Ligand binder design. Structure first.
Ligand SMILES: CCCCCCCCCCCCCCCCCC(=O)OC[C@H](COP(=O)([O-])OCC(O)COP(=O)([O-])OC[C@@H](COC(=O)CCCCCCCCCCCCCCCCC)OC(=O)CCCCCCCCCCCCCCCCC)OC(=O)CCCCCCCCCCCCCCCCC
Ligand SMILES: CCCCCCCCCCCCCCCCCC(=O)OC[C@H](COP(=O)([O-])OCC(O)COP(=O)([O-])OC[C@@H](COC(=O)CCCCCCCCCCCCCCCCC)OC(=O)CCCCCCCCCCCCCCCCC)OC(=O)CCCCCCCCCCCCCCCCC
Ligand SMILES: CCCCCCCCCCCCCCCCCC(=O)OC[C@H](COP(=O)([O-])OCC(O)COP(=O)([O-])OC[C@@H](COC(=O)CCCCCCCCCCCCCCCCC)OC(=O)CCCCCCCCCCCCCCCCC)OC(=O)CCCCCCCCCCCCCCCCC
Ligand SMILES: CCCCCCCCCCCCCCCCCC(=O)OC[C@H](COP(=O)([O-])OCC(O)COP(=O)([O-])OC[C@@H](COC(=O)CCCCCCCCCCCCCCCCC)OC(=O)CCCCCCCCCCCCCCCCC)OC(=O)CCCCCCCCCCCCCCCCC
Ligand SMILES: CCCCCCCCCCCCCCCCCC(=O)OC[C@H](COP(=O)([O-])OCC[N+](C)(C)C)OC(=O)CCCCCCCCCCCCCCCCC
Ligand SMILES: CCCCCCCCCCCCCCCCCC(=O)OC[C@H](COP(=O)([O-])OCC[N+](C)(C)C)OC(=O)CCCCCCCCCCCCCCCCC
Ligand SMILES: CCCCCCCCCCCCCCCCCC(=O)OC[C@H](COP(=O)([O-])OCC[N+](C)(C)C)OC(=O)CCCCCCCCCCCCCCCCC
Ligand SMILES: CCCCCCCCCCCCCCCC(=O)OC[C@H](COP(=O)(O)O)OC(=O)CCCCCCCCCCCCCCC
Ligand SMILES: Nc1ncnc2c1ncn2[C@@H]1O[C@H](COP(=O)(O)OP(=O)(O)O)[C@@H](O)[C@H]1O
Lengths: 505, 102, 136, 125, 178, 125, 51, 177
């Protein structure tokens, strides 16, 4: 019963949501530039900053709704396309349906849009995490950094082109564009003075991996003059070229997606970055690397043993889990948790295009939401209690019961209770790893889910419980409606996404 | 879009606005410079649009000659003893006898 | 595709699958990679001839697809390694039926080349199964 | 280019060869030429027009609903909002309650319509 | 270079490495011109040490112009210097020079940090006063600001228009018969 | 058993009471930073010992070359250092079982000919 | 003959400046070493071209 | 146009088909393509791109179908456990059901393993099995709403075809022996 109307509606929605975002950004930027001689806030109720905040927030939100609709259309379209290809067995019949483009808006960068489930999951993560982070950064943007209210819109446009393109070069360029806005945010919006050095560490560490990926892309392009991302089927790389490409790709994308030993920059940046931008970084900016690694390694044929890469990922997991205990800083502890989860996700991609990719994608989504939740809780603690250190913070539950309850439920979700996409992703990865290498699976599970979990829980429980006798004149009140509903939405997603259609998982 | 003159006019308008903003002067200062910048930008970008296509056409024509150089450069680059080998003997004789038509 | 009908079947249509020999698979893959130019040429020339003489009133309407004959013969020779004749008409009786099916797919039904390559490859596979050691 | 009708004579080719390389029916030739063997370009154009109209309706409805909800329920604290709505007239209260819901619901319904292919002619039995 | 029955086929354009070298030289000159124009717009005596990069901590135009020029010199992807560096690496891969690629990358990353470290010094406790005073007021030159703005636009969006510049440079180099 | 007098090489804070530190690393903010004013903008005076502990680890550093091996326990340090090698060797030994049996092996399988998971593959007229 | 000389010069220069470029403390030195680094990179590109 | 990467090995290549000898380091782009890079990277390289996409989808569906067999037999075991008391339960299970449970073990069905390690012959056999099931279904046209999409005219033609087929099958006499 599938008809061409659904196909064209899917394509039109995907194409036009990008232009909706772009036109919103363009209008907002034109207003901002041409309303004032100097593009800084006027400290009065009639400033354009209020309009810009409104436009950014409710462009992201409306584009997120349209993205939900377009993602559902894509799911139907992909399912029915697979059915059309698979169903017919007659040799004379073949599915050759050709679509003509609309005459209203042009194709951005003269590229035909191609959408995949992983790309749309990444785009949904971008939308939601960007919404949370923009909601967080309101107190940070003041009177000279208001120009960074558009950072998340720029991120959304970059990610949209990144996930809706079938061109290798455009793919790589979109991946590399993410550096400038993130560096500028960390440099100009971070309150702490150590953020200045943290930004440089972030730039250099990420750029080393960017150069590695650039070398790999140069190898692919120079050898294969193609750029369509599908002509690689008709060209085979020799053993030496293939091993060089996989090594470069893995190391370069692991610089971004933190792997052992390349997580020093991540720890520094998470500790010294804005509490609202740490959410976006951990939640989304480390998963574009995973998506790019998946695309490249599934496109290239590799005839090498992945034991070395699996060992690197497992070593990162073990290192982060063991170090969890020794952190009294909640933000650094959450950063180590992010490193652990990202290393597990990266390990999920070490078997080419096997079924491990499904667990990897689900784990990427759950880690995004869980890291957003954890960093937002740390943000609330730091903002109301003027410290994010375990020695200075104690007995949160008895003065701010809602915040303590949020911490406890965050710990329960992090533990991986059944009924959560966290548990589902752990089940996928461990079920595969048990047959792949059962002893390695046992070691990984033991370390991560006992030693790292206990180290993680020690600090959070100590902060939540106790007796806050110190500085009774300065104790805060409670979570606000904004914070409470953000926490509730994170919990709601982590719980209900387990009912998403199992066809794609 | 499609008109290089209009594209250059828009570029000049935005350049003037950006110059005013950077100098911190009101955007209405020196109004006569708006049409001036638009006209200059339109004309220069129109000329460059013509020049790029002329350069591309002449480059395509030059590549024909460069192919002749590559073929003869390859034969002269052959290592000693390879010019009479079975893989290059016929081509060498073609370029040394048939093309010796002066 | 790669399915054999059941000779003694209780119901009208029953099929049992078979897997071609590795030698046959290698031969077909290599020949397709080497001769893929001819198949694209057949598609492009088919469209070109239909455009040129598709109209009934056209002068060349009575010569339809004859120019494609050279491309088809070249593709057949390339796939069969210049053996078993120099023309599609010289196809052995073992592959004659599949050759007729391919011609019906391409020129009469005007079906997609995705469909008609199946029948052309079936012709090649029939020849290869018949001979075996002659092609390799 | 040597692939042309020039120089070709039906005398040279056999009758079976001519029958094999004979043009199909005129209708088949027209369908192949126009690429309308399965679907017509007009069907594609109609589908595209409906898709664009549906997207515009959905996006406009979502924007209207979101903005109306925000502006109506973003006037102040709970007490202030309750007092403002109490002083609000009957028709004004009705619109404030109904506008956002109707816009969002219409957008969602238009989205559901596309995936639900009810207008299929095989409904029988 | 391929031979098929004494017919030579050349899918390689020999006059391409020279064009890439010219492109790199032009890109470096453009970025150097941008930074030097920013310096010339201000008072020259203030800048005498790497610590004095804080003196660039002036109104938004100068501050961000310096920041983006430093990033472009470093080779950050979106900016102009990245195009030259990426094309150099692409040509090295085309010529099959893996060791040259390795050494280029080592030099590139070391130089990248060399440029980046100055962003740390750019931070200043207050806003600097680096403008010359004329008629009792700071002298801001509209002409140099306009030139810096054109340079900034091209630095930001060089990737979009790089195809035309590459065509022109290849056209110039094709006259050389090498 | 751990006591400060007899720990020797397992360092820990001494039990003896000490005077508060006169100088210690402290929180510092970017110039012209916008203050955080949540919940009435009430800031308490920080405890010197607590601030010192907050910033001690970040600034801690090794005094002499090779101190890392000796600090703590040499055996545990060597085991931690060799952990990646142990993991790789365990993976290879496990992969021996996979090779001899026929189960999943550590390789980049390429069942899909570059066809991404549920990707839209279409052509245009 | 030029290829080996260029390679040796490039390697020696890179390994000699890797440490020096981080020892300067002057704006003029920064500009000069930017020029020097770009010169070395272009020399490597020239080696690649003459290959 | 595709290109190549300069080779460093000093090995000699003897092509008996073309009757020439080359060196690995001296190969150009086309020679590299012909001699190196000519290996296969998929189960059925003989098939076209469209045909191999169909083959890949059928293989994925076949793996899911074998997993479905395992799930169905497990559900039947649960049904047997609930319906039949523990006495005689194992006696009744030591029948077709137990043999099928063992025959649907991990080597034959990929329950939760990342990859089902199948040779190209095994993949071809699985695809052939899926195609046999598809043929059996399409004989009676059970795939209209599920596992297929068709227009109204196609549905009507298929209904008429299935009606004729059912009539002929009914009119056929019983199979002897
Ligand atoms: C298909 C194409 C698609 C793509 C688009 C392509 C086109 C893109 C462009 C679009 C725009 C087209 C514009 C066409 C005219 C261009 C003329 C030209 O050459 O420009 C350069 C030139 C300016 O450069 P410049 O002054 O030589 O440069 C000196 C250096 O800066 C050095 O600085 P300095 O400090 O040393 O000196 C400063 C300056 C100080 O002096 C100045 O400020 C410069 C002069 C400004 C005032 C000029 C007089 C204005 C009134 C009369 C205009 C002529 C009659 C118009 C009749 C129209 C009938 C319909 O010194 C001078 O005076 C030196 C110049 C001497 C005077 C030159 C007089 C030029 C007259 C040009 C007339 C053009 C229109 C002719 C129409 C003919 C129709 C048959 O002339 C102008 O631009 C004239 C001003 C035009 C804009 C005025 C803006 C403010 C007033 C707006 C009022 C709006 C009212 C209506 C509102 C409606 C909406 C509600
Ligand atoms: C008054 C001006 C009004 C302009 C209105 C808009 C019209 C277009 C701009 C025309 C400007 C002409 C004159 C130059 C002014 C700027 C330079 C200057 O000196 O200003 C001083 C002037 C006054 O000084 P100031 O404000 O005190 O100094 C502050 C600094 O300038 C620092 O300010 P900032 O931090 O805000 O600066 C921007 C910042 C960060 O800026 C950005 O990141 C730009 C983001 C643009 C939004 C869309 C991004 C989508 C990316 C998707 C992925 C694409 C991948 C493609 C593969 C290759 C990789 C790109 O830096 C960069 O741009 C570097 C990163 C560049 C990334 C490359 C992205 C290429 C996108 C190409 C367009 C794609 C369109 C697709 C849809 C259509 C399909 C048919 O500055 C201003 O008034 C504000 C300028 C801010 C940038 C303006 C343009 C942003 C909006 C662009 C919308 C149109 C798309 C872009 C293509 C445009 C045509 C080529
Ligand atoms: C992808 C990477 C791309 C990298 C690009 C790198 C370079 C980018 C930045 C620089 C680009 C050039 C900018 C224009 C020149 C600078 C001066 C200027 O015009 O502003 C002053 C002037 C400001 O006027 P004002 O503020 O009213 O009064 C100023 C003073 O008070 C009173 O003023 P004044 O009386 O003292 O002086 C008046 C005079 C002042 O202007 C000048 O004297 C010009 C100074 C520059 C001379 C060299 C220009 C070379 C152009 C060719 C391309 C190479 C560009 C290399 C640039 C960097 C070299 C280090 O104004 C003019 O006449 C302007 C004419 C500009 C066009 C000249 C074209 C010459 C072409 C020659 C070659 C033709 C092809 C030969 C083929 C042969 C084959 C056998 O400009 C304007 O009136 C309009 C400003 C707003 C629109 C600017 C549009 C710029 C378009 C640039 C297109 C670039 C090529 C196409 C893109 C290529 C990449 C895809
Ligand atoms: C390669 C062939 C393998 C197969 C053959 C069979 C296995 C042979 C393995 C070798 C065993 C004999 C050699 C071990 C000597 C001890 C280690 C050493 O030399 O470091 C300097 C040694 C340790 O310095 P330290 O760790 O800085 O001292 C800390 C303080 O005592 C302050 O301590 P605390 O009060 O703070 O408490 C901390 C304490 C307790 O710490 C804890 O509670 C935390 C957990 C610590 C780890 C406990 C072991 C867990 C299992 C390890 C499995 C490794 C698998 C990966 C490697 C596989 C290699 C095949 O930390 C210690 O454990 C330190 C004691 C020394 C390490 C003992 C555990 C590791 C030994 C190596 C085991 C290798 C097993 C391989 C086979 C595995 C199965 C296939 O310094 C001393 O001499 C001071 C006295 C320490 C106690 C010695 C007790 C008697 C040991 C036997 C003496 C006679 C040896 C004759 C050798 C003849 C030629 C071969
Ligand atoms: C981890 C290190 C610290 C972090 C920085 C990361 C730097 C290293 C990044 C990975 C580089 C690749 C290493 C694995 C290579 C595997 C293949 C191989 O070489 O085996 C011999 C290969 C494989 O041979 P084979 O035996 O498998 O098959 C071919 C055999 N013959 C040729 C005989 C027929 O043999 C070769 O062809 C030699 C290739 C050597 C290439 C080495 C240089 C690579 C240069 C490009 C990358 C440079 C990145 C620099 C980044 C900045 C550093 C500061
Ligand atoms: C046959 C030909 C007939 C031609 C007839 C002549 C037509 C002339 C048209 C003139 C239009 C002028 C529009 C002015 C709009 C001002 C809006 C405003 O208030 O903005 C102030 C704003 C604010 O400026 P501000 O800096 O003073 O800010 C004030 C606000 N506070 C107090 C907060 C600081 O700035 C501007 O936008 C003004 C500067 C930009 C003006 C751009 C003018 C472009 C004109 C393009 C003409 C194209 C003609 C093409 C002809 C083609 C022919 C073939
Ligand atoms: C608390 C419980 C702890 C349990 C033990 C945990 C692990 C202990 C260490 C296990 C070591 C296993 C070593 C053998 C595996 C070698 C894998 C391999 O091929 O690597 C070649 C590697 C290279 O591998 P490669 O990846 O280049 O191989 C090419 C790729 N393939 C194989 C796919 C074709 O070469 C090496 O560098 C190996 C160096 C070995 C150094 C000596 C190690 C001695 C270890 C002795 C351990 C004690 C005895 C056993 C105890 C247990 C008895 C039950
Ligand atoms: C917020 C309403 C959203 C409506 C849904 C569709 C949005 C499409 C994107 C619009 C972006 C802003 C305008 C851009 C103008 C421009 O420069 O647009 C310039 C381009 C012109 O392109 P070309 O030059 O190539 O022809 O505009 C277009 O291509 C089409 C623009 C959109 C057409 C539909 C308009 C619908 C109007 C709805 C009115 C009621 C809205 C009520 C909201 C509360
Ligand atoms: N930071 C600390 N480091 C090391 N030992 C500590 C520390 N705090 C307390 N101790 C231990 O606590 C005990 C003293 O407890 P305390 O609460 O200070 O009461 P009092 O000092 O009056 O005895 C000592 O054994 C001391 O060693």
């Amino acid at each position: 019963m599938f008809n061409l109307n659904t196909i064209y509606l899917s394509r039109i929605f995907i194409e036009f949501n990008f232009y909706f975002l772009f036109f919103l950004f363009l209008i907002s930027s034109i207003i901002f530039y041409f309303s004032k001689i100097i593009s800084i806030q006027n400290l009065n109720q009639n400033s354009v900053f209020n309009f810009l905040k409104l436009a950014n927030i409710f462009g992201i939100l409306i584009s997120f709704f349209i993205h939900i609709i377009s993602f559902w259309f894509y799911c139907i379209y992909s399912y029915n396309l697979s059915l059309n290809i698979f169903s017919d067995i007659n040799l004379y019949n073949s599915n050759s349906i050709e679509l003509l483009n609309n005459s209203l808006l042009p194709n951005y960068f003269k590229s035909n849009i191609t959408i995949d489930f992983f790309g749309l999951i990444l785009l949904t993560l971008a939308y939601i995490v960007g919404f949370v982070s923009i909601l967080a950064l309101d107190t940070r943007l003041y009177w000279k950094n208001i120009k960074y209210i558009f950072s998340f819109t720029i991120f959304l446009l970059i990610v949209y082109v990144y996930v809706t393109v079938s061109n290798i070069l455009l793919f790589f360029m979109c991946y590399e564009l993410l550096l400038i806005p993130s560096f500028l945010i960390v440099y100009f919006v971070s309150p702490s003075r150590r953020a200045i050095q943290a930004s440089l560490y972030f730039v250099i560490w990420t750029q080393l991996g960017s150069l590695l990926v650039l070398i790999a892309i140069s190898y692919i392009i120079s050898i294969t003059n193609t750029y369509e991302f599908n002509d690689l089927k008709y060209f085979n790389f020799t053993n030496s070229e293939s091993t060089i490409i996989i090594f470069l790709i893995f190391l370069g994308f692991g610089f971004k997606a933190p792997i052992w030993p390349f997580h020093y920059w991540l720890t520094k940046t998470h500790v010294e970055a804005p509490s609202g931008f740490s959410i976006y970084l951990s939640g989304f900016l480390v998963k574009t690397a995973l998506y790019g690694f998946y695309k490249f390694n599934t496109s290239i044929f590799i005839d090498i043993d992945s034991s070395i890469f699996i060992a690197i990922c497992i070593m990162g997991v073990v290192d982060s889990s063991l170090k969890m205990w020794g952190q009294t800083d909640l933000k650094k502890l959450v950063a180590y948790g992010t490193i652990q989860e990202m290393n597990i996700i990266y390990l999920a991609f070490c078997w080419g295009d096997s079924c491990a990719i499904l667990g990897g994608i689900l784990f990427s989504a759950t880690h995004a939401f869980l890291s957003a939740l954890m960093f937002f809780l740390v943000d609330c603690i730091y903002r109301r209690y003027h410290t994010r250190s375990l020695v200075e913070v104690n007995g949160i539950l008895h003065i701010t019961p809602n915040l303590g309850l949020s911490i406890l439920f965050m710990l329960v979700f992090f533990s991986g209770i059944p009924g959560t996409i966290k548990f589902i992703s752990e089940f996928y990865i461990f079920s595969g790893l048990l047959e792949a290498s059962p002893f390695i699976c046992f070691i990984l599970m033991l370390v991560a889910n006992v030693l790292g979990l206990i180290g993680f829980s020690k600090s959070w429980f100590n902060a939540t419980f106790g007796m806050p006798k110190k500085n009774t004149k300065y104790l805060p009140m409670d979570l606000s409606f904004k914070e409470s509903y953000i926490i509730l939405y994170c919990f709601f997603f982590l719980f209900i996404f387990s009912y998403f259609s199992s066809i794609f998982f | 879009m499609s008109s290089m003159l209009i594209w250059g006019a828009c570029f000049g308008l935005f350049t003037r606005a950006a110059a005013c903003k950077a100098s911190m002067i009101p955007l209405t200062t020196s109004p006569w410079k708006y049409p001036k910048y638009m006209i200059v930008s339109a004309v220069t970008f129109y000329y460059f649009d013509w020049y790029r296509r002329m350069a591309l056409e002449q480059l395509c024509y030059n590549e024909e000659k460069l192919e002749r150089y590559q073929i003869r450069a390859k034969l002269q680059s052959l290592k000693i003893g390879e010019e009479l080998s079975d893989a290059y003997r016929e081509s060498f004789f073609e370029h040394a006898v048939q093309k010796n038509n002066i | 595709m790669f399915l054999n009908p059941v000779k003694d079947s209780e119901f009208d249509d029953e099929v049992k699958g078979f897997v071609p020999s590795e030698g046959e698979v290698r031969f077909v893959a290599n020949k397709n990679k080497e001769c893929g130019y001819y198949l694209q040429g057949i598609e492009q020339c088919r469209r070109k001839m239909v455009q040129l003489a598709g109209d009934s009133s056209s002068q060349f309407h009575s010569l339809g697809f004859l120019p494609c004959k050279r491309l088809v013969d070249a593709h057949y020779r390339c796939m069969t390694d210049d053996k078993f004749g120099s023309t599609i008409e010289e196809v052995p009786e073992i592959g004659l039926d599949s050759a007729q099916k391919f011609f019906d797919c391409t020129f009469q039904q005007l079906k997609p080349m995705q469909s008609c390559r199946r029948f052309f490859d079936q012709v090649v596979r029939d020849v290869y199964r018949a001979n075996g050691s002659q092609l390799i | 280019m040597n692939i042309s009708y020039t120089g070709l004579k039906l005398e040279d080719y056999s009758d079976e060869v001519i029958r094999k390389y004979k043009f199909p029916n005129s209708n088949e030739l027209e369908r192949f030429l126009n690429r309308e063997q399965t679907l017509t370009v007009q069907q594609h154009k109609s589908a595209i027009k409906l898709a664009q109209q549906d997207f515009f309706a959905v996006a406009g409805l979502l924007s209207v609903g979101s903005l109306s909800y925000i502006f109506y329920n973003s006037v102040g604290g709970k007490v202030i909002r309750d007092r403002i709505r109490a002083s609000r007239t009957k028709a004004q209260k009705v619109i404030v309650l109904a506008l956002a819901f109707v816009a969002n619901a219409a957008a969602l319904i238009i989205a559901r319509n596309a995936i639900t292919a009810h207008n299929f002619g095989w409904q029988a039995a | 270079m391929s031979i098929f029955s004494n017919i030579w086929i050349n899918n390689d354009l020999n006059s391409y490495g020279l064009s890439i070298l010219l492109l790199n030289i032009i890109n470096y000159l453009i970025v150097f011109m941008l930074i030097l124009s920013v310096i010339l717009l201000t008072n020259l005596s203030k800048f005498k040490s790497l610590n004095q990069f804080k003196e660039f901590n002036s109104y938004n135009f100068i501050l961000y112009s310096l920041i983006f020029s430093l990033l472009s010199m470093a080779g950050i992807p979106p900016l102009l210097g990245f195009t030259g560096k990426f094309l150099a690496i692409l040509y090295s891969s085309f010529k099959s020079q893996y060791l040259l690629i390795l050494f280029m990358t080592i030099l590139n990353i070391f130089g990248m940090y060399f440029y980046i470290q100055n962003l740390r010094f750019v931070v200043k406790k207050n806003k600097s006063s680096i403008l010359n005073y004329k008629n009792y007021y700071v002298n801001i030159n509209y002409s140099i600001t306009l030139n810096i703005i054109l340079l900034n636009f091209f630095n930001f969006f060089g990737i979009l228009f790089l195809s035309d510049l590459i065509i022109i440079l290849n056209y110039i180099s094709s006259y050389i018969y090498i | 058993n751990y006591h400060y007098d007899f720990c020797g090489r397992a360092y820990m804070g001494n039990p003896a009471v000490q005077s508060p530190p006169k100088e210690f690393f402290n929180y510092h903010y970017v110039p012209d930073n916008y203050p955080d004013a949540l919940s009435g903008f009430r800031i308490a005076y920080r405890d010197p010992f607590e601030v010192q502990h907050v910033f001690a680890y970040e600034n801690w550093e090794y005094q002499y070359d090779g101190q890392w091996w000796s600090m703590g326990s040499l055996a545990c340090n060597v085991l931690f250092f060799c952990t990646p090698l142990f993991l790789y060797l365990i993976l290879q030994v496990e992969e021996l079982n996979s090779e001899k049996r026929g189960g999943t092996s550590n390789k980049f399988y390429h069942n899909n000919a570059g066809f991404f998971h549920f990707q839209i593959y279409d052509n245009k007229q | 003959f030029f290829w080996i000389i260029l390679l040796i010069i490039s390697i020696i220069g890179i390994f000699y400046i890797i440490s020096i470029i981080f020892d300067i403390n002057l704006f003029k030195a920064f500009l000069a070493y930017s020029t020097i680094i770009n010169s070395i990179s272009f020399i490597l590109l020239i080696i690649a071209i003459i290959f | 146009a595709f290109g190549g990467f300069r080779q460093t090995d000093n090995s000699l290549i003897i092509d008996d088909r073309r009757k020439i000898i080359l060196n690995t380091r001296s190969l150009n782009d086309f020679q590299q393509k012909i001699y190196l890079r000519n290996f296969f990277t998929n189960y059925r390289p003989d098939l076209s791109s469209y045909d191999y996409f169909a083959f890949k989808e059928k293989l994925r569906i076949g793996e899911l179908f074998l997993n479905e067999y395992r799930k169905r037999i497990n559900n039947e075991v649960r049904r047997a456990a609930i319906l039949t008391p523990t006495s005689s339960l194992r006696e009744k299970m030591n029948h077709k059901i137990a043999d099928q449970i063992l025959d649907l073990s991990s080597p034959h069905v990929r329950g939760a393993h990342f990859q089902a390690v199948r040779s190209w012959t095994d993949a071809s056999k699985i695809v052939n099995y899926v195609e046999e099931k598809q043929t059996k279904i399409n004989k009676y046209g059970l795939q209209f709403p599920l596992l297929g999409n068709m227009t109204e005219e196609q549905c009507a033609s298929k209904e008429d075809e299935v009606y004729q087929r059912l009539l002929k099958e009914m009119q056929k006499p019983p199979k002897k022996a």
